[PDB]
Design a binder for this molecule. Structure first.
Ligand SMILES: [Sm+3]
Length: 275
């Protein structure tokens, strides 16, 4: 009624304000969600303004049946907001544009995986058909399983990646396959897959995991000068405390597991529970 008109006009203003001031747009999108917690489009607006609080992504997901309703009442396509969400998990820095509820699903699953809410992540992934986007769900499962160190389940999800349309995501999948191999002490396989994935369109987005796991594979095989060369490259290009630490200490090694060990977990989601 009166409130509908008010929220419409706040949304329209928020979108117009985006090139001028994300801070002011945020105030307006937040004013909408304060009055209507179900206003999916305004939760997405908040994400666009740099609000990636886990609750904001949860709310966008929870209100997903309202996607398009508020923006639609002022004739704005949600694609015009140019909101993006994180979907790379541990493998790389990969974002995806929020142009449909699929994006929200993927973002929510990645965020839940990061928080350790794996069943909730999986349940969101399986809540609806994916309608020509099977590879995207497989990718997100690889993210969720990887977060829980379920390396054999990662491989199950990405082993088919040669047949994916999206060559970027097929490349990312090769990184996941290589990381999973390394964590299972399949170091030669890890080196082949990570080297190939490095040539793909995902090589840059996944540069950190690619170099780290190559270095760890080389070190565990005994090839210390290769490991050091990769870690020196990392400290130059993507410096990090654990890279500095690994470069200074040759006993710094990847702790690996096996299919049998993963299967013996009292709780498959908990790498600490190996019986
Ligand atoms: Sm999170």
């Amino acid at each position: 009624g009166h409130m509908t008109d008010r929220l419409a006009s706040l949304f329209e203003s928020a979108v117009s304000m985006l090139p001028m001031s994300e801070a002011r747009s945020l105030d307006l999108f937040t004013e909408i969600t304060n009055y209507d917690e179900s206003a999916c489009d305004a939760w997405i607006g908040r994400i666009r303004c740099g609000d990636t609080d886990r609750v904001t992504l949860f709310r966008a997901w929870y209100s997903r049946r309202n996607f398009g309703q508020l923006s639609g009442s002022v004739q704005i396509s949600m694609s015009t907001l140019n909101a993006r969400i994180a979907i790379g998990g541990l493998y790389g820095d990969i974002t995806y544009p929020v142009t449909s509820p699929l994006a929200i699903t993927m973002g929510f699953a990645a965020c839940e995986a990061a928080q350790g809410n794996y069943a909730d992540a999986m349940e969101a992934l399986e809540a609806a058909p994916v309608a020509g986007s099977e590879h995207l769900v497989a990718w997100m499962k690889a993210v969720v399983y990887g977060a829980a160190e379920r390396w054999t389940d990662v491989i199950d999800q990405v082993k088919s990646a040669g047949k994916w349309p999206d060559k970027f995501l097929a490349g990312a999948a090769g990184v996941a396959h290589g990381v999973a191999a390394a964590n299972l002490a399949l170091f030669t396989e890890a080196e082949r897959r990570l080297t190939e994935a490095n040539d793909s369109p995902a090589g840059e987005a996944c540069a950190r995991a690619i170099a780290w796991y190559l270095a760890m594979a080389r070190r565990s095989q005994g090839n210390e000068s290769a490991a050091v060369a990769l870690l020196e490259w990392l400290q130059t290009t993507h410096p990090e405390p654990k890279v500095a630490a690994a470069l200074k200490d040759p006993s710094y090694r990847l702790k690996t597991t096996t299919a049998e060990q993963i299967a013996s977990r009292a709780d498959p989601w908990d790498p600490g529970s190996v019986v």
